[PDB]
Amino acid sequence: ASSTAHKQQDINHLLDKIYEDTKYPDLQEIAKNFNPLGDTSMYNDQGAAAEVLMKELNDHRLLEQHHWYSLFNARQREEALMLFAVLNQCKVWHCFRNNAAYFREQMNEGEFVYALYVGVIHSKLGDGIVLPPLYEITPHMFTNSEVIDKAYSAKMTQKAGTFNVSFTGTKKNKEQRVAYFGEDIGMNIHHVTWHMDFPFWWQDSYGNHLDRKGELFFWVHHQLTARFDFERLSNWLDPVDELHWDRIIREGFAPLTSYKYGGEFPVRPDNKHFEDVDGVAHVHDMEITENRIYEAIDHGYITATDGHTIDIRQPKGIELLGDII
């Protein structure tokens, strides 16, 4: 029941054809009849997390299915983490499986996929499971619009096919020379999995501490940056400049990619100045935040909420900077 074979098959089934109601009769039956609140002894918190999520569901406060999802959207992230919190409290696999099946059919698919992945990664119940590659679970997030269009045409015409992916832009765009780095599907899996392993929303009340996370955050991104610059050097290009909030972003981008639901990803023109983003931040807020971080660095200490100093002139200083940055 909780053998590796059954848990793996359950996860495979839950992630199969994620944009449609489940086609597996056993999962259909669970989603119809299981009650996340029916027996709260299955949870290490006696049902607190399930109560939170069920109240949001019953009050019609959750993001609808067939809608874009972004982990950087505060409310959508909070909704995905409500499901993660339920899965994380499950004592045994049948709780994990049944809640996953129940909420798969109620919740936005992007939120669901995210919660199930981090639930598997951060629960002991997920030990031994191999998560399918996200580029086959949500291929729109890893595949350009031209190839997706060819897939839609194959499906409309009921014909199989294999379609070649090319890079975006043209040869006139020198940045295309290094598209094989940031568009590589495995490099993108590396990146999302690092953040799934070391999420910025992690709280140790979820079960365990993530050792040196803030320093690993610095290091993994330093390595992405240094590796990209090595590809630029390999292709007769100069190193990337750094962004600054008061200077133009020289290199624009046309993704030529689309969401499954939500439309095409937006383009950014060349040589644009940063503008304030309504509901996110003013450009000036970013500059102030940057200044405050540099104040801590140049002071040698981070300032606590009550004004006391937290020394960063020690080996953990870089980690604490990762935490606040």
Place this chain on the structure above:
Amino acid sequence: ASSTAHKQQDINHLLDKIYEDTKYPDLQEIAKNFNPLGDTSMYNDQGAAAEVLMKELNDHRLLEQHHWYSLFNARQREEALMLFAVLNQCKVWYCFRNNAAYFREQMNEGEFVYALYVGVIHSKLGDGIVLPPLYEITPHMFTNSEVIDKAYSAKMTQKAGTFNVSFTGTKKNKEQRVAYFGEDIGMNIHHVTWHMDFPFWWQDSYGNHLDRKGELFFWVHHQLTARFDFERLSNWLDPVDELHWDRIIREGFAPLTSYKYGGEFPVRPDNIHFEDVDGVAHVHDMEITENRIYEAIDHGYITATDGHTIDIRQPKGIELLGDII
């Protein structure tokens, strides 16, 4: 003589025809013969405020009559407050009336009117007095130049008349749609009187504490702003933008109003950037000040002159912020 009738009559006479020497023979006699330094027992401060003001007067250091006055001008405010301080120390009405009559004939009329108003408001001797509306005491400050010119013409020709005021700007100026809000003479009296009741120069050594003043400062201006935006919404306009020191002030203004002495009020063009103001501040100084206030808010404490923390994560915090802002 201390009856409400006589005190009101005295105030009416002191404020009558304020740009000319007093036409009331009894006030003339007082102004000629009263000695503010002649009986220290008149005052709760043993005569100190009277000595301070008389020294400035005798040293010819006071602003001349028939000259513009601005409460925001440090030296002119200091002079007005020297007269306030005398009135505020008078024990009995005859001291208050006689000092007011004496200094009416010695001091700038704008300073005098200001000091007499705040003196009445903040002295128990002022209880029961109704201050005349400032739009009839200094009508230039509430009446556009065209109507003042018609009044001057009526006086030149010795012919009574009533003249219609009809809002600044043209119909091509969408901001004129809501001119009835900020140009309403009563709204302007509301605003000046709030600041007279709750002056930024108040010190409790003047006799009493002004409860929650800094928070009331936030609230009265929040309500002015919210009420203006309701007029904009009523007139098919969007809400006002906020000012930014580094961004253009979109909407200029032509007051089409004049001082009695000092000339026409200055116009501001549309779409101008802030410039440094000689003798006042650099634009960058405003940005630094803003940054320091936001530092206190985001720290949760104000920093005292010796560096210690003043907690604002409490109900009085908004009041302390009003004090420093």
Place this chain on the structure above:
Amino acid sequence: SSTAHKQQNINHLLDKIYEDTKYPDLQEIAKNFNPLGDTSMYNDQGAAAEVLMKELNDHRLLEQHHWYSLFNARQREEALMLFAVLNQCKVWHCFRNNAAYFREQMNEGEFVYALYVGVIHSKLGDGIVLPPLYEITPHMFTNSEVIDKAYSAKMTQKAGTFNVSFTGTKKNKEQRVAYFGEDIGMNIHHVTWHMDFPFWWQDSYGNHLDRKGELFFWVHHQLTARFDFERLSNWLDPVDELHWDRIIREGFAPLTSYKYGGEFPVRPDNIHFEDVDGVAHVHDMEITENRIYEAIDHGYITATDGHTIDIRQPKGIELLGDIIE
């Protein structure tokens, strides 16, 4: 070891500084003297001589016949290594012999600098009068036109005296006051003040420089006020202040050259500051400025561990000069 002999030694060492020494005694010393041969001549028993000799032997010192700038961190460090040796000499023969030895090994600009500050800050230098730098390194005080006539006079082996005119043209109103900043004595005053009160001074060199940070404020205040008096004398307005976010109105063409390194660069009129690679971003200057003003307006300087150093006291101005220079 008397003043006459010490003065002559210095005269000889500074003679024809761009060429190997022509004095047989100094050539013999440069050939045979070992700075490490008798450490009993140093107060540090040879520590400074060991540091400099290692740099020399590892071929890490700036070559001869190359421009030198005291503001270049590594070149300054090299000059100060020689200063450190001279400063450790107990007796004059150590000072003279090390000077002669390193004159032939080190860059001439570094050597002249080290020899001057060595004479000034060693008791062995008492009674010596340093030759004017405008005759030791005339390129740094003489426009390129006159140097060329000197070069021509030497190429043709004919004596001459050549008139120096001020830089610019009569169309350049700033030329009206060129006699101030271009005066060779005013230039010597300025270099010598900084030689007497160097920003690199550490009291481990042997003594404290009393009130240095306040004298730094004062000497430059007086240069600024004196320049403005010349502007007033020539129908010019006072100088504006620089700001990092505003154009530098007045450009400058020095029309002067290094002996080695080429012509001094020109600055066009009306330029915005640009970031300087290897030095600082313009934004870094603004942040540094802000931090200094934070200390001034707080009334205290913040120490490395966060504790406050009160500057509301007579030494505050000195501490400000310490942190501003």
